[PDB]
Amino acid sequence: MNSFENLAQDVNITRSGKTLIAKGTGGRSSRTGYTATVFGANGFLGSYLTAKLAKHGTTVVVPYREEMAKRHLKVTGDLGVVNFLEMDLRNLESIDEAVRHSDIVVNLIGREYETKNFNYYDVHVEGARRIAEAVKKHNIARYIHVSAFNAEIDSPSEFNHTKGLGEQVTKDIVPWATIVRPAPMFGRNPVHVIDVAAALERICFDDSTVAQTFELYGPQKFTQKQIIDMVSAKTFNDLDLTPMELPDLMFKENKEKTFVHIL
Amino acid sequence: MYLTYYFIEITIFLAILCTIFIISAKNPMVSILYMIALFVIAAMYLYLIGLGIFSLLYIMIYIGAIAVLFLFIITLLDINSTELSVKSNIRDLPLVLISLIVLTISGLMIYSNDSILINKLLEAFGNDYNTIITQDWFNIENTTLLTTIGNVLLTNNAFILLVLAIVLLLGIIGPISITMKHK
Amino acid sequence: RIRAFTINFGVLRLILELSGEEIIRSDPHVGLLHRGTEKLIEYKTYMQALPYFDRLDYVSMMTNEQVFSL
Amino acid sequence: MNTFIIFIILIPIVGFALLAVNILLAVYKRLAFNAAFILVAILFLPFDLEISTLLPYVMSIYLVSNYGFTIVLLFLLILIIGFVYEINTNALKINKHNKPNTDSLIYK
Amino acid sequence: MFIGTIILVLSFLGFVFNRRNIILAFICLETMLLGINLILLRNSVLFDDISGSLFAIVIIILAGVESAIGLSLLVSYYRLRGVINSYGI
Amino acid sequence: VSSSSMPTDFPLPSQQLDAVANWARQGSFWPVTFGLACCAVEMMHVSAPRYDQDRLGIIFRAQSDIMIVAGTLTNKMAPVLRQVYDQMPEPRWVISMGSCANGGGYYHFSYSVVRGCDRIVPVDVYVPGCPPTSEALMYGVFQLQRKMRNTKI
Amino acid sequence: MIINIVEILIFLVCVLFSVAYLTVAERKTLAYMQRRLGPNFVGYYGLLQAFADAVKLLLKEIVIILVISPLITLITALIGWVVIPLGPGITLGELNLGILFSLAIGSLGVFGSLLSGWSSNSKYSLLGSIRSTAQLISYELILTSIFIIIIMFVSSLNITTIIETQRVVWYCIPLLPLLLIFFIASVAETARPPFDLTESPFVFFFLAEYSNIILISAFNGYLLLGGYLSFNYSYLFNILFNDYSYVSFLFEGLINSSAYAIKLVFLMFSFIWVRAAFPRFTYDNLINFCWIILLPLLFGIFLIIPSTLYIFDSFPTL
Amino acid sequence: AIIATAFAETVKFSGSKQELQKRTLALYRQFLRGAPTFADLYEVQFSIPTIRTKIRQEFERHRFVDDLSIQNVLYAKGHMEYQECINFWKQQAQFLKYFPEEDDIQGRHQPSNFVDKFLKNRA
Numbered sequence A: 001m002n003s004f005e006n007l008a009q010d011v012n013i014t015r016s017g018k019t020l021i022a023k024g025t026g027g028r029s030s031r032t033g034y035t036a037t038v039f040g041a042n043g044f045l046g047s048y049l050t051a052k053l054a055k056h057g058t059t060v061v062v063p064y065r066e067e068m069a070k071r072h073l074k075v076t077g078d079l080g081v082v083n084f085l086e087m088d089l090r091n092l093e094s095i096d097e098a099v100r101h102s103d104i105v106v107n108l109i110g111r112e113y114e115t116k117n118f119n120y121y122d123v124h125v126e127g128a129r130r131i132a133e134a135v136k137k138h139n140i141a142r143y144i145h146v147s148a149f150n151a152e153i154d155s156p157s158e159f160n161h162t163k164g165l166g167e168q169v170t171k172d173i174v175p176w177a178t179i180v181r182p183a184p185m186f187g188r189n190p191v192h193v194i195d196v197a198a199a200l201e202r203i204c205f206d207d208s209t210v211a212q213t214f215e216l217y218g219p220q221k222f223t224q225k226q227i228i229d230m231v232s233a234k235t236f237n238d239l240d241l242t243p244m245e246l247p248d249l250m251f252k253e254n255k256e257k258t259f260v261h262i263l
Numbered sequence B: 001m002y003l004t005y006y007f008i009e010i011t012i013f014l015a016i017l018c019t020i021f022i023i024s025a026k027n028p029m030v031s032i033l034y035m036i037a038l039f040v041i042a043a044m045y046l047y048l049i050g051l052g053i054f055s056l057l058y059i060m061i062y063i064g065a066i067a068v069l070f071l072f073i074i075t076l077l078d079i080n081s082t083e084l085s086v087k088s089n090i091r092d093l094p095l096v097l098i099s100l101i102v103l104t105i106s107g108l109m110i111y112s113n114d115s116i117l118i119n120k121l122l123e124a125f126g127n128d129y130n131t132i133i134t135q136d137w138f139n140i141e142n143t144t145l146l147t148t149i150g151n152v153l154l155t156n157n158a159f160i161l162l163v164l165a166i167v168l169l170l171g172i173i174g175p176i177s178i179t180m181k182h183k
Numbered sequence C: 001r002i003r004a005f006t007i008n009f010g011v012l013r014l015i016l017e018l019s020g021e022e023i024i025r026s027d028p029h030v031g032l033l034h035r036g037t038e039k040l041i042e043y044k045t046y047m048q049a050l051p052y053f054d055r056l057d058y059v060s061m062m063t064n065e066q067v068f069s070l
Numbered sequence D: 001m002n003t004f005i006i007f008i009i010l011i012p013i014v015g016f017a018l019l020a021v022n023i024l025l026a027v028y029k030r031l032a033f034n035a036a037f038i039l040v041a042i043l044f045l046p047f048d049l050e051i052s053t054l055l056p057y058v059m060s061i062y063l064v065s066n067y068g069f070t071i072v073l074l075f076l077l078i079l080i081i082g083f084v085y086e087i088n089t090n091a092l093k094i095n096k097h098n099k100p101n102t103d104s105l106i107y108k
Numbered sequence E: 001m002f003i004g005t006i007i008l009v010l011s012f013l014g015f016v017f018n019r020r021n022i023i024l025a026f027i028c029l030e031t032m033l034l035g036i037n038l039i040l041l042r043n044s045v046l047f048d049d050i051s052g053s054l055f056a057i058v059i060i061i062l063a064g065v066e067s068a069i070g071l072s073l074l075v076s077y078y079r080l081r082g083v084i085n086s087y088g089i
Numbered sequence F: 001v002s003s004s005s006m007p008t009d010f011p012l013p014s015q016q017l018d019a020v021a022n023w024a025r026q027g028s029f030w031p032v033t034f035g036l037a038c039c040a041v042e043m044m045h046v047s048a049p050r051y052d053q054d055r056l057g058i059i060f061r062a063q064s065d066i067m068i069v070a071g072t073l074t075n076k077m078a079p080v081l082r083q084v085y086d087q088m089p090e091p092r093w094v095i096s097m098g099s100c101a102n103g104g105g106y107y108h109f110s111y112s113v114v115r116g117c118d119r120i121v122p123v124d125v126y127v128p129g130c131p132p133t134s135e136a137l138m139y140g141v142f143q144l145q146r147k148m149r150n151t152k153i
Numbered sequence G: 001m002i003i004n005i006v007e008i009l010i011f012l013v014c015v016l017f018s019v020a021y022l023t024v025a026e027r028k029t030l031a032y033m034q035r036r037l038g039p040n041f042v043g044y045y046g047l048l049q050a051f052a053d054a055v056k057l058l059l060k061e062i063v064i065i066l067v068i069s070p071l072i073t074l075i076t077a078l079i080g081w082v083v084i085p086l087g088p089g090i091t092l093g094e095l096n097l098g099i100l101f102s103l104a105i106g107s108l109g110v111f112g113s114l115l116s117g118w119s120s121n122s123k124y125s126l127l128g129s130i131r132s133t134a135q136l137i138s139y140e141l142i143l144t145s146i147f148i149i150i151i152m153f154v155s156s157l158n159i160t161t162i163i164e165t166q167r168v169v170w171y172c173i174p175l176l177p178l179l180l181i182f183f184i185a186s187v188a189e190t191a192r193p194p195f196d197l198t199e200s201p202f203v204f205f206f207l208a209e210y211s212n213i214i215l216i217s218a219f220n221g222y223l224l225l226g227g228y229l230s231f232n233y234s235y236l237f238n239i240l241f242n243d244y245s246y247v248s249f250l251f252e253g254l255i256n257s258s259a260y261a262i263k264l265v266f267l268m269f270s271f272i273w274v275r276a277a278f279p280r281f282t283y284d285n286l287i288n289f290c291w292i293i294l295l296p297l298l299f300g301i302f303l304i305i306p307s308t309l310y311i312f313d314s315f316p317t318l
Numbered sequence H: 001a002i003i004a005t006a007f008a009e010t011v012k013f014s015g016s017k018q019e020l021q022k023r024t025l026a027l028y029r030q031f032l033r034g035a036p037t038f039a040d041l042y043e044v045q046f047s048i049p050t051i052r053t054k055i056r057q058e059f060e061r062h063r064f065v066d067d068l069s070i071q072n073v074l075y076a077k078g079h080m081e082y083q084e085c086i087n088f089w090k091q092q093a094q095f096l097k098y099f100p101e102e103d104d105i106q107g108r109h110q111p112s113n114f115v116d117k118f119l120k121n122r123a
């Protein structure tokens, strides 16, 4: 029968002091006991993330911006596992509401272009300042902020600059938050996306990853010409994972005389 | 108004182009599609010369039956076909460059009656002279072209229509002679 | 040699091997609406086993009810 | 510029417009046959093509009085015997093996 | 006479220089008959007679029955074989 | 830039070219029906002369952007159901008719049954009832049309 | 110049409208054949059905040739509208060989059925496209042969010449069996379901289908039934009007187009009326019906007509 | 139903062990020969040698079966599985029932000793 390959144990304590006991065997119908809030779970990494997270029965709180991008997240969990409630980055009260009962909480709110509504400064450092100030307000354990590779505090790019700014602000206000920096991602060097989500779930739950910056980069380093010709800190080894190779993933007369043709 | 002058030489250039796209194509259906393009460029030329009746007969039987026939055959049959590669067809080029010259010039030779062999060719191109069209009031009923074909096939050449019956007869007997396998 | 091609002709899957227009052999799949109603009535009393019979053959339901209640 | 020719210039424009609005608004992304199927089209042509041999008579029917009549009658009567050839030979009918051949059961 | 001679010569060399399939032979043969018609019909117009058009309306029919016969010949060739070869018959 | 001028408050979306194609999607609605058991006839009672829904424009007679799961989804068919759900255009919905199609139903403890199509497809409206009357199915469709219009994708 | 572009504007816009209101008329009358309301309404707002589903039809998915066959099918279906006359001598282009044109375009209309089966090919789907093609050409034969035996009485390829010849008596009433077999050959060109095995970019086939429906209705209406002719109406005018004026030419063009449109509308209603009542054909039955039984009758009618013109003087003069 | 389906055989029960050994031998030859068809047909991610080593290790599982009639039912079940697999009756989610260990590693903490079993009370 399905087992908690998620967990290390059956009775676990969190940092804030709440006691969490896993019920039954691992599987869809069971409950691990953790409550997780995944900001940006409509997106491309968060989909695999709360696929793995709501697989065993952690009550996943999904904050959504649009009502139609969230619908395929209903089938990844049991009755009462995945929970949808709308929020906006602008309205304080919805961020306040979304992290009231969470044990762990992650953001992957990251946008590669400016909108008429949000520049680079608005979604990366300032939204993260906002939601992580709420995390400090409620004393939620295990906050995780996923960032970008090449996140320098001062850089010609504004994206990378503001990713570094978001890292510095969330490290400033919360000391116990963990900030993870993945490589380029190829779901279907670069890292496969199920490997990034596997690494993130193994970040989520254990002790001794606290206040630790992580580099999640794949096995072998590439150039863009090499990639197109193929088409035509702590690493993985902290959390006991081996990332998949990009090349293996990349694919993912007489008889006619004795047949009959005019019938 | 003399935009409307070069209309014949235009369709000549289009027919050259269209046969270049006949004999250089990937699929076997792309060639017959440019072939029905060739039939309709022809039918435009036949209207252009003064024969409105024929152009529509060419549409009726040449993008009519025999088109549908060839499209049909290429559908329900498999036919291997290679591409026009340079490694298999550049060997034919110095024969084509001779035969183009010789066959075109000789096909333009016999419209002449001199005996010089250079004045024979130069009467094919030396014709830029405008025929004068007079009105004679001798014709009283609209015997157009199709009436006269129906008068000549039926009285003066009734035997050609009557041997023609045997030819169409044979075109019915033949495919039943072959493709049946009686019993 | 006759070479027949196969096609995937309520809920019903049905394999047809065709030599042109003619059917030379046919093979109906079935089971895509098998839901185990014969085993479930062993765990239900007769008063509770009664609706399992208008579940099956639903177009003429009272006759299917009647055969069990006879 | 008469009124016939804008129409057959203007319609390919209407088709191109109804096609370009489709390219603007859409979402993108051997077996053996019977002889009757090939024979319908192969044999269709000599029956489509006597019709166009019949087209010059029907326009000039008044001139060829009493004589082009008999020539057309003989032409058609030569075509009818090839027609009765194909309908005597059961040419278009497609057959199958559904009969058990109706052989009586013989014992010992 | 240009359009007829050009269709005839180029269709002829399209017949002669194929090695890829069998149908290009058929359709180049058919466009040769078109090329003969394009010369004949203009000699009918320029001489003011129907008798070139008489030979035209006869050779339309003979091109038709030619196609009917020859495609039944191809189905004879295909029934016994499996697939018509690339290189030819 | 160095700082922000963004508001710390904004109303919720509930608290607050393309258009003619969405007007077309409203006034015509062609569900590729997955009628697979008992409820498929009750769906055909919409197509019957009493409960037509001919007037707004739902026609159940048969590549659109909604399907309707109606009847018990067995073990054998869950890949076939998902494969039919996959080759639909992207702005897609599904409604679950009946009680055998949401949470297993009458056959909930059988071995060869999927306990509702929530395990397979993401469903947006449920029409409950074991034979839910054409009344209830049509009312579910009206609720779903309200949801589709409030989307305004 | 302006004189003729306004004219082709009015004609194109009227025919483009009428083909779109047929898609509503078919839904309505088949609703009331089976005692349903069907579509809600039919008015000026009534196009917004056929508009709205013609919009939404362009929102599904499809899976250089695929571009061309819907295009040539629709332009072949649309160019044949000039040659019908709508009144005496009213054509959008006047040509003495209009039947030869009409016949050549009934010949051009077969190609989209070929080139539609190439797209998204399978083995069995390709065979099905072959069957639809062969029934289309098979009934095109008997179509063309009866065009001949109609213009045997005219001996002219002009169309207004046919209808002005038809002034004394319609061709439908001597040759009534010909009307019957043309109506079935007319729902044979199209895929109407007594004759629809082989059905049972899409917007172009959808439009061109109904355009062929109403256009072969027109081809019935001018040669078998009276084209624009209803009655003599010489006596009513001598009481109404005093002299030729633009009001008088308006009133006569109006009643001529009414007499043409009533033929076309009753025939068009009869297409939808023969849709509902009958099941469809086996394809062997379709080909057997075309060749073995109906076409010997067609040779017989073809031999009996010139002999009847022969027994009396009665050859028609051009 | 007069005629059978394509690759079927009449189920018939041998009286000796050597004839059964010949039949299972021919059967492994049939699976191993049809193994390149299954990768094309069911669209698997992985290589043909992994299909072949699985067919081998699924016959390793019943190598030391003594009783004749249990070998008989085991042959009949194996022929039914070949029958379903060589056609398109099984789909690509029931063909991958056979490979659960290959597709994905579920996560950390596969318990080996009694302590790792016992921290989540034997899972």
Ligand SMILES: CCCCCCCCCCCCCCCCCC(=O)OC[C@H](COP(=O)(O)OCCN)OC(=O)CCCCCCCCCCCCCCCCC
Binding pocket: G177, G178, G180, G181, G183, G184, G194, G270, G274, G285, G289, G293, G294, G297
């Ligand atoms: C004057 C001397 C001679 C006297 C005789 C009169 C001859 C002149 C009349 C010629 C007109 C012929 C009309 C077409 C003939 C149809 C032939 C027919 O109906 O039966 C043959 C055919 C089946 O062939 P078979 O194997 O023999 O079947 C035996 C079953 N009894 O049947 C079939 O395959 C199909 C049968 C149905 C055909 C399609 C139906 C189309 C529906 C349209 C019906 C009319 C609708 C009219 C609408 C407006 C009415 C107001």
Ligand SMILES: NC(=O)C1=CN([C@@H]2O[C@H](COP(=O)(O)OP(=O)(O)OC[C@H]3O[C@@H](n4cnc5c(N)ncnc54)[C@H](OP(=O)(O)O)[C@@H]3O)[C@@H](O)[C@H]2O)C=CC1
Binding pocket: A039, A040, A041, A042, A043, A044, A045, A046, A065, A066, A069, A089, A107, A108, A109, A110, A111, A118, A123, A127, A146, A147, A148, A149, A182, A183, A184, A185
């Ligand atoms: N190559 C890559 O993919 C890389 C990505 N990353 C980072 O990892 C994280 C996830 O990766 P990726 O899948 O690519 O990113 P996503 O595609 O998931 O980013 C979109 C998600 O974030 C949400 N988002 C962005 N801005 C806002 C905003 N103002 N308010 C609410 N939601 C917002 C989006 O909301 P909605 O659903 O409405 O669109 C959506 O949920 C990101 O933070 C990214 O910066 C790290 C390095 C490289």
Ligand code: SF4
Binding pocket: C055, F037, F038, F039, F070, F071, F072, F097, F098, F099, F100, F101, F105, F106, F129, F130, F131
């Ligand atoms: S939901 Fe009810 S009526 Fe419908 S199929 Fe299931 S059991 Fe039958």
